[PDB]
Design a protein around this ligand. Structure first.
Ligand code: OTA
Ligand code: CL
Ligand code: CL
Ligand code: CL
Ligand code: CL
Ligand code: CL
Length: 298
């Protein structure tokens, strides 16, 4: 077994996930979020306790108001970047696709549903029907649904994003995990990893593209779980060495760039499970990828 496997066993045996997770919350970075808290931005924030730090926030390329609730998570050692953002609001869907355009993202990873626990957690920011495209008048963008591939618990959509100012056109891939409860965990590591590897296999995480945009409702809980597992697997892959990966330290590093990443102790516990199981693929057993596909029942 791996060293994270031994740690996992010991934390489970002693029932100390809550205290481990709370220790991460206590040590996490605290940086100012002054732009986020300006009164003119109050209606650009979904949650009053979830704000991007000033130092890592994504700036829109407009001179009236450059603010969006989004953070650049720049993982220097892993050499991968992600943009984590809240589920867009009815007045920030233009800003969201403006951000995708300006940052040259190829993929958007959505980990939530529009309605959860009886509430609207995210605006309907993409078109559901080919023939009903969306136009974002404030940012002058056009968005068309090109096709969609619906599986049991996730959906992949091809979108066309057009800068109406230049008539330039880009293909955006939308990866929508549709079975991960808010404040909850995926149904299995298998189905989480099946989805993550689908994002990976698309090419959307390539350094040739802008950072992938990852969001849930707040852009911290599920988004943080997704990013932590991906980065840990990537660090392991780069060194081909499971023992070089200290998952809690990686999470603390990520939290330098956005607050609150991973919102429950069980999501941290699940992060371990995903990385431990994903390690089998990283370390040369590609048959596990087939097993996940079956176990996930797509
Ligand atoms: O969507 C996620 O995974 C996520 O982190 N959601 C979060 S984080 C967070 C909230 C929510 C929410 O959805 O209500 C409510 C206010 N406090 C912090
Ligand atoms: Cl103001
Ligand atoms: Cl939905
Ligand atoms: Cl509901
Ligand atoms: Cl909304
Ligand atoms: Cl937190």
């Amino acid at each position: 077994s791996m060293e994270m496997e031994k740690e996992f066993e010991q934390i489970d045996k002693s029932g100390s996930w809550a205290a481990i997770y709370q220790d991460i919350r206590h040590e996490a970075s605290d940086f100012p979020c002054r732009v986020a808290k300006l009164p003119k931005n109050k209606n650009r924030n979904r949650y009053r306790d979830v704000s991007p730090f000033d130092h890592s926030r994504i700036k829109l390329h407009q001179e009236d108001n450059d603010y969006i609730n989004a953070s650049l998570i720049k993982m220097e050692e892993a050499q991968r970047s992600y943009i984590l953002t809240q589920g867009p609001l009815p007045n920030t869907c233009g800003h969201f696709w403006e951000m995708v355009w300006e940052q040259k993202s190829r993929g958007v990873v959505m980990l939530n549903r529009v309605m959860e626990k009886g509430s609207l957690k995210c605006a309907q920011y993409w078109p559901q029907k080919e023939e009903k495209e969306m136009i974002f008048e404030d940012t002058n963008l056009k968005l068309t649904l090109i096709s969609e591939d619906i599986k049991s618990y996730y959906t992949v959509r091809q979108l066309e994003l057009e800068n109406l100012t230049t008539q330039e056109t880009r293909e955006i891939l939308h990866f929508h995990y549709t079975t991960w409860p808010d404040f909850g965990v995926p149904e299995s590591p298998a189905s989480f990893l099946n989805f993550l590897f689908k994002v990976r296999e698309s090419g959307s995480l390539s350094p040739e593209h802008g950072p992938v945009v990852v969001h849930c409702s707040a852009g911290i809980g599920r988004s943080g779980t997704f990013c932590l597992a991906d980065t840990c697997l990537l660090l392991m892959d780069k060194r081909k060495d499971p023992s070089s990966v200290d998952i809690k330290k990686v999470l603390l590093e990520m939290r330098k760039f956005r607050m609150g990443l991973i919102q429950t102790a069980d999501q941290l516990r699940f992060s371990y499970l995903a990385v431990i199981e994903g390690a089998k693929f990283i370390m040369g057993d590609s048959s596990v990828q087939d097993q996940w596909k079956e176990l996930s029942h797509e």
